[PDB]
Every structure is written in structure tokens, then in C-alpha cells.
């Protein structure tokens, strides 16, 4: 599993969405480098203008590319499930607004790491920060706290995303995450730790479609050392 990430791995992302009846689809392409926790991806909408802001989809749109320090590699559940992969499910509750319900299969298809997602949003307000497109085009760094879920042979994750609003306020989005392996091979169940994640959003000047260029750096941390 870990051997699959020793070099640059191509990435393909596919998402079909439905928020308050508004259907949309997103496809992303790029590459990742797990040795340095880096990835570069370019997502484009295939259904026209997105009904939701791009920052709301960032966490939904491949933590297997996280850089785990050498003293923590036994706590990397994501790579241990490869190539068969894992199912990533999330409930994203935006404060005072709607809720995303996502389900994704992250796995290898040949040499490519693929993330196929189905997303569903409910109870979103028309004048809210999401449907109203009130969120700024940027992304703060966040720590994704991971805990083992031995009963399901997987992990759980929990963290709060804070989206900057154009009026200076903050749109909270509580993330509740569950990952379970697809295959039957043994997986690594980690001790408590977290992923320091940072993201930079940009735009391709030659891209005409509604799109989002994303570069990400993730580093696992929170495991002790040195007696």
C-alpha cells in the first residue's frame, strides 16, 4: 500500500452533486506526491455555473497523499487500504444553513488514484452564504483530527472548517468523517493524531469553464517520540 506512493501518482476526481435540487458535476485532474504531502489538481464544472461556492467542495474533492513522518507511518490508514481503497463518508453541517452528505470511493484504477464522489445538500437557505455565493475564494489551514474505529475496521475524523465570508464574518462547517476499507486485507488502525492541512485556491487564466485550481500540503502530526 505505502509502496504505491513512493513517486508522483496521477489523480482523477469525479463528483456528482445535488444541493436543494440543483444538480451539478465536477471533474478534477492532477497529480500527488505523498513523500512531501503535496498535490496539484484542476477541477472544472461540466454542468455550467456551480450552485455552490468552490470552497464548500474543497474538503469533499484524497488524504492518502498525506505526508506521514517516519515515526508515524504505522498510523497511515489511508495508504494501507490501497490499491483496493476505502469509502469516505462525511456529514458537513454548515452553521445556520444546510448540510452536505457525501460518499466517496478513493481507490487505484491502474496507476491512477481515483476519487469518485456523490454529494447531497439539504436545507440550504437561498440567501445563505452558500447558495448566495457569499464566501471568499480562499481557504484557511485546518487540522483534521483522526481517531481509530476498530469496530468498522476503519477511522473517524472530526474538524471544523471556517470559510471567510465577504462581510468579514466566518461560515462554520462542522465535518464528521468516516472511512472504511473496500478490500479485506489488513489495514493500519492509528492512534489519535491529526493532519495539518493547507490549501491555496487559484484560477487558470486560460480556463473558460467555472473551475478551481488547487494546491494542497498535508502533514500528519501529533504522535509522540523520544522516550
Swiss-Prot record:
The keyword RNA-binding does not apply. Green fluorescent protein has been engineered to produce a vast number of variously colored mutants, fusion proteins, and biosensors. Further generation of mutants led to more stable proteins (at 37 degrees Celsius for example) with brighter fluorescence and longer fluorescence lifetimes. Changing residue 36 to N: In EBFP1.2; shifts the excitation and emission spectra to shorter wavelengths and increases quantum yields compared to BFP. Changing residue 156 to Q: In R10-3; matures to the red-emitting state with excitation and emission maxima at 555 and 585 nm, respectively. Changing residue 192 to I: In mut2.1; shifts fluorescence lifetime from 3.03 to 2.50 ns. Changing residue 196 to F: In H9; increases fluorescence at 395 nm excitation. Changing residue 63 to L: In RSGFP4; increases fluorescence and shifts the major exitation peak to 489-490 nm. This is Green fluorescent protein. Changing residue 62 to N: In R10-3; matures to the red-emitting state with excitation and emission maxima at 555 and 585 nm, respectively. The keyword Transferase does not apply. Keywords: Chromophore, Luminescence, Photoprotein. Changing residue 197 to H/W/F: Results in significantly red-shifted excitation and emission maxima. It comes from Aequorea victoria. Changing residue 62 to L: In EYFP; leads to yellow fluorescence, folds faster and more efficiently at 37 degrees Celsius and has superior solubility and brightness. Energy-transfer acceptor. Its role is to transduce the blue chemiluminescence of the protein aequorin into green fluorescent light by energy transfer. Fluoresces in vivo upon receiving energy from the Ca(2+)-activated photoprotein aequorin. Changing residue 66 to A: Increases fluorescence at warmer temperatures such as 37 degrees Celsius. In GFPmut 3; highly fluorescent mutant when excited at 488 nm. It comes from the Eukaryota. One of its GO terms (biological process) is bioluminescence. Photocytes.
Amino acid at each position: 500500500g505505502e509502496e504505491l506512493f513512493t513517486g508522483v501518482v496521477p489523480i482523477l476526481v469525479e463528483l456528482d452533486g445535488d444541493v436543494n435540487g440543483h444538480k451539478f458535476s465536477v471533474r478534477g485532474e492532477g497529480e500527488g506526491d505523498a513523500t512531501y504531502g503535496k498535490l496539484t489538481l484542476k477541477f472544472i464544472s461540466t454542468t455550467g455555473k456551480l450552485p455552490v461556492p468552490w470552497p464548500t467542495l474543497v474538503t469533499t474533492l484524497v488524504q492518502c497523499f498525506s505526508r506521514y513522518p517516519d515515526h508515524m507511518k504505522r498510523h497511515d490508514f489511508f495508504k494501507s487500504a490501497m490499491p483496493e481503497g476505502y469509502v469516505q463518508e462525511r456529514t458537513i453541517s454548515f452553521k445556520d444553513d444546510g448540510t452536505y452528505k457525501t460518499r466517496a470511493e478513493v481507490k487505484f484504477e491502474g496507476d491512477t488514484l481515483v476519487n469518485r464522489i456523490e454529494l447531497k445538500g439539504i436545507d440550504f437557505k437561498e440567501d445563505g452564504n452558500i447558495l448566495g455565493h457569499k464566501l471568499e475564494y480562499n481557504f484557511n489551514c485546518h487540522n483534521v483530527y483522526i481517531t481509530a474505529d476498530k469496530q468498522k475496521n476503519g477511522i473517524k475524523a472530526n474538524f471544523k472548517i471556517r470559510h471567510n465570508v465577504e462581510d468579514g464574518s466566518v461560515q462554520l462547517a462542522d465535518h464528521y468523517q468516516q472511512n472504511t476499507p473496500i478490500g479485506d486485507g489488513p489495514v493500519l488502525l492509528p492512534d489519535n493524531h491529526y493532519l495539518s492541512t493547507c490549501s491555496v485556491l487559484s484560477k487558470d487564466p486560460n480556463e473558460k469553464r467555472d473551475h478551481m485550481v488547487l494546491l494542497e500540503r498535508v502533514t500528519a502530526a501529533g504522535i509522540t517520540h523520544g522516550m
